[PDB]
């Protein structure tokens, strides 16, 4: 029963989930002074041409847009991967106020919210088996800021009055994922892990230093959402976010000067 609240939010997820105090816990602040670039890190290949969404969920504490990981058809390789990693989901954090909902932070600022286009890597078979290795996923963390409308967002928002509640779910197909991708593709990696329960430590995360904008109209459209299942108390899905852990023993590198 870990969620977002005052009796179950990040503070207490630790009593379910040990790892929680890990050595390698996600999200972070990135320093940028901090940073070290590091220029043997290669261009991220970000391969989205093929992609297959199926359908778009509310799971209680995002939407998960879903996407046919059967085949190579979304990949992500490059950067500081090794091998090739499949799409199977993206979702997004957000807050209750423009001035929070991401997750990673960049020299201590929020974001409106958090994009994450979660990978698994092809070597072990599915994402089940990936996310117990150290290796096993890579996500591609792009932040929000409110400005000038998404176009490419605009077709996920628009859904959402279909997945008001937890639990239902809504085909969604021939969504492009390339249409919510800034410009540049220059990132900082480090080791972490899923930034929900079970917080396994196997991600390489990717975040992306330029920001996507979104429109005000399309981020209240997020926090229309509802974290209960129909029927049940109306509780609005925002603040979805959990606040950046210790570094310990890690450095950010960063692909760019
Ligand atoms: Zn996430």
Redesign the pocket.
């Known amino acids: 029963h870990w969620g977002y609240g005052k009796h179950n939010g990040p503070e207490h997820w630790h009593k379910d989930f040990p790892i929680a105090k890990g050595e390698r816990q996600s999200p972070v602040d990135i320093d940028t002074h901090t940073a070290k670039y590091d220029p043997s890190l290669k261009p991220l290949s970000v391969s989205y041409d093929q992609a297959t969404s199926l359908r778009i969920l509310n799971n209680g504490h ?1 939407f998960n847009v879903e996407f046919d990981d059967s085949q190579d058809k979304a990949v992500l390789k490059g950067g500081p991967l090794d091998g090739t990693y499949r799409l199977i989901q993206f ?3 957000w807050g209750s106020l423009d001035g929070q909902g991401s ?1 990673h932070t960049v020299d201590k600022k929020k974001y409106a919210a ?1 994009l ?1 286009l ?1 990978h698994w890597n092809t070597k072990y078979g599915d994402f089940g088996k990936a996310v117990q290795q150290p290796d096993g996923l890579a ?1 591609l ?1 792009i932040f929000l800021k409110v400005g000038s409308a998404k176009p490419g967002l605009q077709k996920v928002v628009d859904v959402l009055d279909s997945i008001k509640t937890k639990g239902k779910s809504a085909d969604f197909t021939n969504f492009d994922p390339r249409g919510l991708l800034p410009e540049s593709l220059d990132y900082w990696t480090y080791p972490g892990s ?3 329960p079970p917080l396994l430590e196997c991600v390489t995360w990717i975040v992306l230093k330029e920001p996507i904008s979104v429109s005000s109209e399309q981020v209240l459209k997020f926090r229309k959402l509802n974290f209960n299942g129909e029927g049940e108390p109306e509780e609005l899905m925002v603040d979805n976010w959990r606040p950046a852990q210790p570094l310990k023993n890690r450095q950010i590198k960063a692909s760019f000067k």
């Open positions: 995002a979702h997004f954090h997750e958090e994450h979660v996500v963390g899923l930034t929900t």
